[PDB]
Design an enzyme around this catalytic site. Sequence first.
Site, PDB file in Angstrom:
ATOM      1  N   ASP A 128     -16.899  -8.426 -28.324  1.00 50.57           N
ATOM      2  CA  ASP A 128     -15.709  -9.103 -27.737  1.00 50.57           C
ATOM      3  C   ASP A 128     -14.557  -8.150 -27.851  1.00 50.57           C
ATOM      4  OD1 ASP A 128     -14.054 -10.671 -25.930  1.00 50.57           O
ATOM      5  OD2 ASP A 128     -14.297 -12.672 -27.272  1.00 50.57           O
ATOM      6  N   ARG A 132      -6.722  -8.580 -26.273  1.00 49.84           N
ATOM      7  CA  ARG A 132      -6.203  -9.974 -26.789  1.00 49.84           C
ATOM      8  C   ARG A 132      -6.799 -10.039 -28.386  1.00 49.84           C
ATOM      9  NH1 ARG A 132     -11.571 -11.904 -24.847  1.00 49.84           N
ATOM     10  NH2 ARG A 132     -11.355 -10.381 -23.218  1.00 49.84           N
ATOM     11  N   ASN A 133      -7.768  -9.439 -28.646  1.00 52.66           N
ATOM     12  CA  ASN A 133      -8.404  -9.474 -29.964  1.00 52.66           C
ATOM     13  C   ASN A 133      -7.963  -8.326 -30.751  1.00 52.66           C
ATOM     14  OD1 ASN A 133     -10.059 -11.739 -29.594  1.00 52.66           O
ATOM     15  ND2 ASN A 133     -11.609 -10.561 -28.497  1.00 52.66           N
ATOM     16  N   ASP A 146     -11.349 -11.314 -34.652  1.00 56.01           N
ATOM     17  CA  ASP A 146     -12.286 -12.194 -33.526  1.00 56.01           C
ATOM     18  C   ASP A 146     -13.479 -11.870 -33.600  1.00 56.01           C
ATOM     19  OD1 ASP A 146     -12.742 -14.343 -31.720  1.00 56.01           O
ATOM     20  OD2 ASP A 146     -10.596 -14.404 -31.214  1.00 56.01           O
TER      21      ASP A 146
HETATM   22  C1  LIG Z   1      -2.614 -13.609 -28.162  1.00 55.91           C
HETATM   23  C2  LIG Z   1      -1.972 -14.326 -29.142  1.00 55.91           C
HETATM   24  C3  LIG Z   1      -2.483 -14.228 -30.473  1.00 55.91           C
HETATM   25  O1  LIG Z   1      -3.357 -13.566 -30.665  1.00 55.91           O
HETATM   26  N1  LIG Z   1      -1.783 -14.835 -31.593  1.00 55.91           N
HETATM   27  C4  LIG Z   1      -2.139 -14.795 -32.934  1.00 55.91           C
HETATM   28  C5  LIG Z   1      -3.174 -14.934 -33.498  1.00 55.91           C
HETATM   29  C6  LIG Z   1      -3.424 -14.476 -35.142  1.00 55.91           C
HETATM   30  C7  LIG Z   1      -4.386 -14.118 -35.736  1.00 55.91           C
HETATM   31  N2  LIG Z   1      -5.762 -14.466 -34.973  1.00 55.91           N
HETATM   32  C8  LIG Z   1      -6.913 -14.925 -35.741  1.00 55.91           C
HETATM   33  C9  LIG Z   1      -8.064 -14.672 -35.040  1.00 55.91           C
HETATM   34  C10 LIG Z   1      -9.490 -15.075 -35.522  1.00 55.91           C
HETATM   35  C11 LIG Z   1      -9.493 -15.640 -36.936  1.00 55.91           C
HETATM   36  F1  LIG Z   1     -10.495 -16.174 -37.557  1.00 55.91           F
HETATM   37  C12 LIG Z   1      -8.187 -16.044 -37.507  1.00 55.91           C
HETATM   38 CL1  LIG Z   1      -7.967 -16.520 -39.227  1.00 55.91          CL
HETATM   39  C13 LIG Z   1      -7.170 -15.497 -37.024  1.00 55.91           C
HETATM   40  N3  LIG Z   1      -4.576 -13.942 -37.125  1.00 55.91           N
HETATM   41  C14 LIG Z   1      -3.382 -13.945 -37.823  1.00 55.91           C
HETATM   42  N4  LIG Z   1      -2.176 -14.143 -37.089  1.00 55.91           N
HETATM   43  C15 LIG Z   1      -2.183 -14.283 -35.934  1.00 55.91           C
HETATM   44  C16 LIG Z   1      -0.935 -14.535 -35.141  1.00 55.91           C
HETATM   45  C17 LIG Z   1      -0.776 -14.550 -33.935  1.00 55.91           C
HETATM   46  O2  LIG Z   1       0.456 -14.674 -33.113  1.00 55.91           O
HETATM   47  C18 LIG Z   1       1.879 -14.554 -34.014  1.00 55.91           C
HETATM   48  C19 LIG Z   1       2.766 -14.383 -32.924  1.00 55.91           C
HETATM   49  C20 LIG Z   1       3.515 -15.468 -33.415  1.00 55.91           C
HETATM   50  O3  LIG Z   1       3.474 -15.852 -34.682  1.00 55.91           O
HETATM   51  C21 LIG Z   1       2.186 -15.360 -35.020  1.00 55.91           C
HETATM   52  C22 LIG Z   1      -3.073 -14.023 -26.706  1.00 55.91           C
HETATM   53  N5  LIG Z   1      -4.301 -14.100 -26.314  1.00 55.91           N
HETATM   54  C23 LIG Z   1      -5.373 -14.826 -26.923  1.00 55.91           C
HETATM   55  C24 LIG Z   1      -4.513 -14.097 -24.787  1.00 55.91           C
END
Ligand SMILES: *[C@@H](CC(=O)Nc1cc2c(Nc3ccc(F)c(Cl)c3)ncnc2cc1O[C@H]1CCOC1)CN(C)C
Length: 307
Positions: A128, A132-133, A146
Amino acid sequence: GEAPNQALLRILKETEFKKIKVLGSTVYKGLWIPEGEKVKIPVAIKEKEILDEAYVMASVDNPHVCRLLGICLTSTVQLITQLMPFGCLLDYVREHKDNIGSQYLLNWCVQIAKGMNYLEDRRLVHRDLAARNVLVKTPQHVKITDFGLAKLLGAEEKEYHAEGGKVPIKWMALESILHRIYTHQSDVWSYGVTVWELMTFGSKPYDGIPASEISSILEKGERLPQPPICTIDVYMIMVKCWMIDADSRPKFRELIIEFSKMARDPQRYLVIQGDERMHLPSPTDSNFYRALMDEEDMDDVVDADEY
Ligand SMILES: *[C@@H](CC(=O)Nc1cc2c(Nc3ccc(F)c(Cl)c3)ncnc2cc1O[C@H]1CCOC1)CN(C)C
Ligand SMILES: CN(C)C/C=C/C(=O)Nc1cc2c(Nc3ccc(F)c(Cl)c3)ncnc2cc1O[C@H]1CCOC1
Ligand SMILES: CN(C)C/C=C/C(=O)Nc1cc2c(Nc3ccc(F)c(Cl)c3)ncnc2cc1O[C@H]1CCOC1
């Protein structure tokens, strides 16, 4: 069947998190304060298939890949990772379409391929990969995340057969679409699409076309178009990634190199209107390293750390 995965799964108590705020659908902002150690570790929190995603993230250590800090068992299972403050790169490039320059774009490309090559060495097929990831730690430091669909391969096994489940079609390699086969070389395809995503400042693949027409589009020969900012040199690489023969695609270690050489002179490979005016990231260790050599050699010098 490789060595015993000797990773440590750390179980965290509910009473260690503070100032939890939501991000959307679930993921949360938050602060981790380990047993009276008087420190704040900013974290993201995602709420048994999730226990596979944990096993993977627990098992990966690399500067361009997100590592699980721990899980939490209170009420329901929760994955805890280091908070990436600037969020996903897809949103980031959209948010800064007119402030992003050529050095950044090429720096991210390297960083992603660096992460993916790592995953290839650990026998993980991500399945994946997409913009976005990819998350932003700082504007000049990105990490892959992800692993919900990630799969491990045996020493023997070369492919992975899927049993039927939702997968994003517009990043998928053809074999994946038609034959449900996944390989490091299908992740390469996805990497190509991700680069196309960056080079068009967060555009949607095949925008307009539905998922049903895709397999049949790609069978006919058609690909994503050359982004306006991309020299033929860069587009070539993307198209190489989208070749029908999985073994003819570039190899993540080759992609590091190709993109690293371009990063020396980004304005030669990307033509961004107003690039003079854009903010520059800090010089890369490689780009620094090369300037310290003799002028006669610099044409073809390569930092061994990227080889
Ligand atoms: C993107 C928005 C986005 O990714 N936001 C975001 C994600 C994130 C993550 N992701 C994550 C994924 C899997 C997992 F197992 C864990 Cl534990 C976490 N991890 C840490 N910090 C993140 C911050 C984040 O955002 C930031 C912006 C505002 O403040 C935080 C949109 N697509 C999904 C389309
Ligand atoms: C990648 N480019 C497209 C844009 C570059 C952006 C950038 O550097 N941004 C931003 C850089 C920031 C920064 N940089 C910094 C650097 C070196 C240091 F030693 C220290 Cl202590 C801090 N420090 C604090 N906030 C920032 C917010 C930014 O951006 C936010 C605020 C508005 O938009 C998002
Ligand atoms: C390094 N050089 C090659 C050029 C430097 C460029 C640069 O810094 N740019 C740009 C710098 C910006 C900036 N910097 C900033 C720094 C410190 C601070 F404390 C605060 Cl509050 C802000 N803040 C907000 N937007 C910016 C947009 C830029 O560029 C955009 C807008 C115009 O065209 C592209």
